[PDB]
Structures are given as structure tokens and as C-alpha cells.
Amino acid sequence: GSHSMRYFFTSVSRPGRGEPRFIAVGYVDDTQFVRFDSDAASQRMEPRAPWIEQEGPEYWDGETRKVKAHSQTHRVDLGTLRGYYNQSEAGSHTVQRMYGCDVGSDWRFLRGYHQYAYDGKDYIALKEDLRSWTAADMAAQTTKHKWEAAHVAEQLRAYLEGTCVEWLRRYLENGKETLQRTDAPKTHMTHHAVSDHEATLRCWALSFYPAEITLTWQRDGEDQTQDTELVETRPAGDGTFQKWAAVVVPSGQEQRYTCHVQHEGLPKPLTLRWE
Amino acid sequence: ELAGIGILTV
């Protein structure tokens, strides 16, 4: 019932030569809707969901200027961090930025964030109160002081409590068909014996939306946090997601285990066992 | 909608 808008930015230095790579993508919940790629030809912000296309030229010009502005910022950042950390200019380095907002079932503001990584670790993050900063290390303190003096946090808080939420609502309504749908997971079950006396037994959840799901294993209705293999929820490429959970079990009690499937598209939990 | 404010060089 909750929802979220998030923007993801990756900036990668490709040194010895020049011109970094910048990729920005934007998501409403689990659905990508816009993107920008500095290596593509258009040099514009591009639609990636049917419902964002109907937006006007002022929107796209706007988003383009803003996204270019983000990259230029990151491009200065790469030099800057390189200096902060006494790194040479022979190595490829990475800046990452994630921001956005969460709303509840009624679409009222729930939470906001703006996080910043260098070479894949935390560099500086806006805290939950949206008024203060976490600096992961000593070099990051410099950035912190600068951002405090420049009142970055109040500006981000305006975006995160106002614009983000508002536009999330606009996107959810405009994209009603796609965004507010729930696809019930189609389930089934496979069995492959491993060593005569042993068999691996796997519970399959398919074609579900959104990505949030729960696949759990019980024996006789008892928790199995031990022997379990659980793979990351993965995209099917058609808007939905797939996942599974397997457990390794001695042959003969394949009816002493049940797999439980929880999803919001489901009326009640599904518990399955063998036939 | 992207942020149009609060994006500052580190």
C-alpha cells in the first residue's frame, strides 16, 4: 500500500583519457520510468514507461537541465574526491548518489533520504530528520561543513517533503493502470534428488508485482532459518519479478515440509506441499 | 521529478 519515488545516479571516471560516464535512472516503486545516459546520442532525459510520455516539453527540458546539472556536479566531485584521498589520476573511480521519498497507504509523506557514496562506500548521508548529516570519515567532514554552511539540508528537505511526494502522487495517478496494479504470484514446485537418500526441493514464485514478497520454509510448522537457500528477487523483464526458495532434505519426508508464500496481491497466504 | 535544489559539489 506504501509507495516510493527514487532517483539513482552513477558517475564513473575513465582516466588516462577523459569524459566520465554518467547514468541516471528514476523509479516509481519497482518501475523504472525515466533515464539519462551520458554515452547515448540524444543527451536528453528519456522516458522508459508508457505513462510518463504524455508529459510536455517543459517537463523534459526541465528534467534534462536538472540531470545535466547533476552530472556536472558529479564531474567536479570526481576531481575533488581524488584530491581528498591523495589518489593518483590513473585509476577509475565512482561516485554514486541516491535520493527520494516514501509515502504510506494514503500517499502522505512517510520518509525521505539523500545518500552519497565514493568507490562504493558511504561518504555522506542526510539523516532521517532531514536537518543533519552523517559523514562516514574524516575527509567527508570537509564536505559536511561546506554543506551545513550552504544550507543544503533545508533545500533537500523542501524537495523531499514537498516536490518529491507531490510528484509521486501525480505519477501514481497518471500511471494508475501500471503503478497501482498488483500481480498475484503464480506458484509451483520442483523436486530433484541429489544423493539417493537426499533430495533438493524448491518453491517457485513467478509473475508477481510488486517485488516485495515472502518465501519461507517450515517443517511440521516449525521455523527453518538454518538449512535454506534463498535467491535474490529477480526481474522477468516484462514488469514482473521471479524468486525461489530451496531446501535440502533426506528422502522420505517430503510431506514434512511446507513452503509459505506471502504477497499483497494474494487474498490469503499460500502454503504448498508435495502431491 | 528531479531535485532542482540542494545538489551541491562536495
Epitope: 517543459e58 517537463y59 526541465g62 528534467e63 536538472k66 545535466k68 546539472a69 556536472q72 556536479t73 564531474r75 567536479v76 550552504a150 533545508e154 533545500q155 523542501a158 524537495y159 517533503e161 514537498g162 516536490t163 510528484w167 | 521529478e1 531535485a3 532542482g4 535544489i5 540542494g6 545538489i7 551541491l8 559539489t9
Partner: T-cell receptor, first 102, second 113 residues
Framework: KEVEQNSGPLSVPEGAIASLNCTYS??????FFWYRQYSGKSPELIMF????GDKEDGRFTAQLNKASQYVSLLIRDSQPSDSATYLC???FGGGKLIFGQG | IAGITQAPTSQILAAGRRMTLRCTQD?????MYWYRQDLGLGLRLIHY???????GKGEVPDGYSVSRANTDDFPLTLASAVPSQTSVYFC???????????FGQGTRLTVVE
Amino acid sequence: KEVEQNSGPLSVPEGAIASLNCTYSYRGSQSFFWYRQYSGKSPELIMFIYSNGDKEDGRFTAQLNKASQYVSLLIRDSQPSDSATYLCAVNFGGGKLIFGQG
Amino acid sequence: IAGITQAPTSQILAAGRRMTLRCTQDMRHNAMYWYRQDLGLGLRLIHYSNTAGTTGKGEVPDGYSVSRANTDDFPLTLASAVPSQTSVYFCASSWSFGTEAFFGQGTRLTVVE
């Protein structure tokens, strides 16, 4: 693009509440500024506003309505030293800071 | 004390001559701007720059060059000076894109044949 203020010149008596408005096209605009310009001088910031609602600063009140594409400036208790041209600026993206006519 | 400076403050140009207005700033601001003002048309954005090294076209790029080799400076350039460019020119700067712009003192420029 399109930033439009009240057509001047306006005349307000001393001590009275004065009121300026500004309307803008872009719905995605996120930052709004009010500047004061005396004749042959440089625009000086009276105030800024990011969020829907009111912002108080002494004799001045900014008012922003994102839904109506609207910014407002309210001068309480007018001095004659407020006799000046007033500028509305809105940001349309990156470096695209656009000014009203005044 | 950190601020922003234009130069010259005043200039008379013969038409066809080329001209560069200096503008510099020690506040460590990323974003800078050139505007023109005309006796009834308010300020109109000429060029801008979000960061050292990068630039962009405003409402009236038409007529003027521009460059941003570093953070401090943002010179505005006129190739062939037409009399239609007689205006007052302002350089302004802001911390980042979308935050308050601080103006310099201005430059009164008159182009005559």
C-alpha cells in the same frame, strides 16, 4: 520561458500594506526569489521561498502556491524607502534562472 | 570579504568593435550568470554556467560568447557590437543551481556607430 508580474507602476500610500504577485508556467519549478532594485542599482535579495505556504521576514511576507503557480510578496507598514522596482525570479531547471519584468 | 565584481562599470562602444566584460567571484560559488536589463523589459538571461568548465544558453544567447575556464571567472564577450546590445549587463552567481543569485554592481554599455 514565462515569468509574469503585476504591470506597474503601482502607487501605495505610506504605512499601508503593499502587495505584489507573480505567476509562472513550469509546474516543476522548485525555487522562487524576490529581489529589490533601486534605480540604476543592482538587484538585492529580499527573500527566497522553496515550500508551499508562508514565509515571514520582518515587514515582508512571501507566499507560494505551487498548485496555482503563484508567488506573492506582502509589505506590511510601508516605508517610502520601499519605493523601488520589484523583481520576481523563478528557476526553470539548472542554470535557467528567469526574471519577471518587474 | 568574499563577493562578486564586474569590470568595467561603464563603457561606450563603437559599432563593430569587440568587447569583454570581466566578472569574478571568490565565494566558491559553482553557478554563474549573465543578464541584460532594458528600460522596460526587466532582466533577461543571456548565458549561464552550473559549474567550472561548463556553460549553457539562456533566453538571449544571441550575440554573445562566454567561457568558464575556472570557478572564479565568467567573462561575457561581444564579437560584432551592434547598437541593439546597448543595455545594462549584470553578472550574478549562486552556490548551486537553483539557489539564490548574488548580483554584481552592473555595467552600463552603450553601442554607437
